[PDB]
């Protein structure tokens, strides 16, 4: 029998979860999100209650406003995109084979899952937290010894940069000016700043084609606009790398 | 060049109809001067699409020809009762 409703698929908790409650303010600072680990005596096999990770969204007056969708494998990560939508968290998704990849997931103020992107991180990698830029344009993912920068032009979240450090405690964004990240690497205060750049090929009139190269972490996509004006979410004959690319340039 | 007149007639017609003095006399003269019944009618249709049919028909009259006038008057929407007797009377009289 064809049906409209979708099955329940109750959530659960992971193994590398950090059992500390976390709090995030949204950019307008009119609601805040609190994430915790909680166990519920669910109707599904009420004999033994199920422990998982959940969160709630409260108003500025402390009033509880919304609960969260029960997702199988949320972690202690949680951050609110300063635009005011898409609370960002992370998920293990470790039930069935080849479906196992830690992925950043999104939620709304209703706490109903809405969109995600698959971090190309190894399954066993430990992720400390996530963050958002001041203007909500870039999202930083922090791990034990490396930070990742993500952006999105057409919902295709690129891995723009990966800063390699030794021992990362916390990572912050500059509030008044975006693209200025700071962190504490092994007892050192480190400041990094970023700026958009067009990886342009030569524009010199003899044999030029606007060979714009876009980095996608392990990928380097090509677009010779003078040959095939491919819109950005697709690309023209990309090439790969062994690791995570930092920046690219094109020969004359 | 004879070849240009052979081929690029419609250019010359456009030129004659485009100059502000509107040298339609030369245009219709050269159109009738063509020794054909296929291209000449095509050029007349082209001219009527380009230049107003009433003025071009008046110019055809002023060119002292009735056959060309009758050919044009089939593009002017006037009732044929209102010009066919006229063209017949013009046709069956002395030149002067």
């Amino acid at each position: 029998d064809p049906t409209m409703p979708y099955m329940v698929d109750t959530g659960d908790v992971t193994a590398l979860d950090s059992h500390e409650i976390t709090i995030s303010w949204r950019g307008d600072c009119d609601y805040f999100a609190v994430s915790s680990v909680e166990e519920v005596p669910d109707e599904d096999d009420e004999t033994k209650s199920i422990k998982r990770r959940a969160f709630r969204v409260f108003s500025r007056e402390g009033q509880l406003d919304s609960a969260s969708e029960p997702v199988t494998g949320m972690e202690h990560q949680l951050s609110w995109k300063p635009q005011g939508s898409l609370i960002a968290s992370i998920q293990r998704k470790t039930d069935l084979g080849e479906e196992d990849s830690v992925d950043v997931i999104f939620f709304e103020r209703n706490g109903l899952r809405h969109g995600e992107f698959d971090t190309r991180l190894p399954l066993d990698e430990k992720v400390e937290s996530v963050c958002w830029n001041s203007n909500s344009e870039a999202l930083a993912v922090v791990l034990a010894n490396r930070i990742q920068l993500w952006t999105s032009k057409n919902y295709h979240w690129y891995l723009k940069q990966e800063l390699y450090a030794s021992d990362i405690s916390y990572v912050k964004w500059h509030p008044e000016k975006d693209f200025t990240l700071m962190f504490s690497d092994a007892g050192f205060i480190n400041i990094v700043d970023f700026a958009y750049k067009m990886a342009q090929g030569p524009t010199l009139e003899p044999f030029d084609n606007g060979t714009s190269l876009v980095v996608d972490g392990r990928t380097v996509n090509i677009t010779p606009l003078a040959l095939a004006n491919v819109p950005p979410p697709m690309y023209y004959r990309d090439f790969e790398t062994p690791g995570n690319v930092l920046d690219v340039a094109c020969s004359f | 060049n004879p070849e240009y007149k052979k081929k690029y007639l419609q250019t010359i017609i456009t030129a004659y109809a485009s100059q502000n003095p509107q040298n339609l006399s030369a245009a219709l003269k050269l159109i009738s001067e063509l020794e054909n019944s296929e291209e000449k009618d095509s050029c007349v249709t082209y001219l009527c699409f380009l230049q107003d049919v009433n003025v071009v028909y008046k110019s055809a009259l002023s060119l002292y020809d009735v056959s060309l006038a009758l050919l044009v008057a089939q593009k002017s929407q006037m009732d044929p009762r209102e010009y066919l007797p006229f063209l017949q009377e013009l046709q069956d009289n002395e030149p002067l």
Binding site: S85, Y155 | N54
Partner: protein
């Protein structure tokens, strides 16, 4: 007498105007005044109209003097006379396998209305025309085209719309009969076989320049798309109403958003053009999520459809929403709030997407609560001007409305080309436009048939670029320019060996002079 002097007044007016116009002379006093000076000798209520005098001109003079009163391109020059018809009332498919019908569709077969088709209230002009024709396609089409002829239009490119419920949920014989009847009422052929009807309509005068069939995402499978392309369909209209799955679930919608997106991809890869319906003020949405979904709609490269239809949620008696609005569970927006919301949404419409309509024309005396006025777009544009930003909609930048509303003429035409990625495909959007004044003169969409989703035996055989839509409104050799540039793109930019344009059966001859040969339901051309 009362009216005879009116008839003879119209007669003398016609004869005198014909005599004056034969040698090329205009009138003086807008004949109605001259009409009265003779017909109102006793002033017995004789009130003529422009249609009245037009229905008096003799045939030989009528067909040649009529267009000398109208000059708006899309009105009488482009002549895409939108002629809407309706199918017999029937119950929309999902009701069977869910339990109840959509929770916001007013009217139908088992509402307080016994006569109106689903999602209709039997009071729109189309509904009275359908009933006075008893939902028969032949009478509907003949009457509408004849009413258009009477009102002085010189219509030559009839474009059909098949409104009312889901037309795709009917027995195949009935739909075949409906389409054959439409094409027959257009051309004049009196046959019964769909193949012959198409073949006849292709040569027909008063070309069937296309036909639109609003439907549902589930009923647009491969076989259904093959059926509608057999019919002659050129644009699809798909109900979406929400990108949030919870709203679709709570509205008894019966189709997931993922299904909608898949259908979008496969239909756009079948050469169609899709126009989607986008309902604001759906229950459990709120202004924040309304703006969110309308901002994502053009931002997610998966939907990005070429048309749009914003239909603010109107509650009407008898629906599933009256038993939920009466209890106060759901409260509508505010008039100012909704006007502002429409302003902000329209601020985000990209240049290629055309806003086909705004809030439904369901009568005010029947709506329980919703939009107050009936001129929502007027206030939306006024508020847009107040906010400073401006609209990029095709319909708000095309030449035809500007020449009569804005009264602005175009003088800086230039070639512009967008190139975006939608529904898994690379879609180019060529146009000739006015950069200084933002006036669109001609447009042409174009798509690279994606390997993932294309299925037509005409396309999977060799790489193909589809000219999904070509439209010229306001010398005038534009279609030629756009078509040539599209050829160049498909040869170099796309690397496609055969470029094929989907076309309404009426216009299939126009591409003949362009060197296209008819392959299946498309007008194709190898390269």
């Amino acid at each position: 007498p009362e009216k005879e002097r009116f008839i003879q007044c119209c007669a003398d007016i016609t004869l005198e105007l014909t005599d004056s116009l034969t040698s090329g002379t205009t009138r003086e006093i807008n004949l109605n005044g001259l009409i009265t000076k003779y017909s109102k000798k006793y002033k017995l209520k004789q009130q003529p109209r422009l249609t009245d005098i037009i229905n008096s001109i003799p045939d030989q003079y009528k067909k040649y003097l009529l267009p000398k009163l109208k000059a708006k391109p899309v009105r009488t020059a482009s002549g895409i006379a939108v002629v809407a018809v309706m199918c017999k009332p029937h119950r929309c498919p999902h009701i069977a396998y869910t339990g109840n019908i959509c929770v916001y569709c007013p009217g139908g077969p088992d509402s307080d209305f016994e006569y109106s088709t689903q999602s209709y209230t039997g009071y729109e002009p189309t509904s009275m025309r359908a009933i006075r024709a008893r939902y028969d396609p032949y009478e509907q089409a003949r009457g509408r085209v004849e009413q258009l002829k009477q009102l002085g239009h010189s219509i030559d490119k009839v474009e059909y719309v098949l409104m009312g419920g889901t037309f795709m949920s009917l027995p195949k014989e009935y739909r075949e009969d409906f389409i054959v009847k439409l094409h027959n009422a257009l051309s004049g052929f009196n046959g019964n076989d769909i193949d012959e009807a198409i073949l006849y309509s292709q040569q027909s005068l008063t070309k069937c320049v296309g036909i639109t069939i609003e439907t549902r995402p589930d009923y647009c499978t491969q076989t259904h798309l093959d059926d509608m392309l057999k019919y002659g369909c050129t644009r699809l209209e798909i109900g979406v109403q929400s990108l949030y799955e919870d709203v679709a679930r709570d509205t008894n919608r019966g189709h997931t958003v993922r299904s909608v997106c898949e259908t979008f991809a496969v239909s756009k890869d079948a050469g169609y053009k899709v126009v989607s319906h986008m309902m604001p003020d759906l229950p459990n949405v709120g202004m924040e999520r309304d703006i969110e979904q309308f901002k994502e709609y053009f931002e997610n490269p998966d939907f990005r459809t070429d048309g749009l239809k914003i239909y603010p949620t109107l509650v009407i008696r008898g629906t599933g929403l009256y038993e939920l609005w009466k209890t106060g569970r759901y409260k509508s927006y505010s008039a100012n709030a909704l006007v502002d919301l429409v302003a902000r949404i329209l601020a985000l419409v990209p240049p290629w997407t055309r806003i086909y309509r705004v809030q439904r024309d369901i009568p005010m005396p029947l709506v329980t609560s919703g939009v107050d006025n009936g001129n929502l777009r007027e206030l939306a544009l006024a508020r847009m001007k107040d906010l400073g930003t401006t609209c990029r909609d095709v319909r708000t930048r095309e030449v035809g409305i500007q020449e009569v509303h804005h009264k602005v003429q175009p003088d800086q035409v230039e070639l512009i080309r967008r190139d975006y990625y939608a529904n898994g495909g690379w879609e180019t959007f060529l146009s000739y436009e006015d950069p200084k004044k933002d006036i669109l003169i001609g447009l042409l969409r174009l798509r690279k048939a994606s390997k993932k989703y294309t299925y037509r035996k005409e396309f999977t055989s060799q790489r193909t670029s589809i000219v999904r839509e070509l439209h010229v409104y306001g010398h005038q050799g534009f279609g030629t320019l756009l078509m040539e540039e599209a050829e160049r793109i498909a040869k170099e930019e796309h690397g496609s060996e055969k470029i094929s344009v989907i076309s309404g059966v009426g216009v299939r001859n126009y591409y003949g002079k362009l060197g296209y040969e008819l392959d299946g339901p498309y007008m194709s051309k190898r390269i």
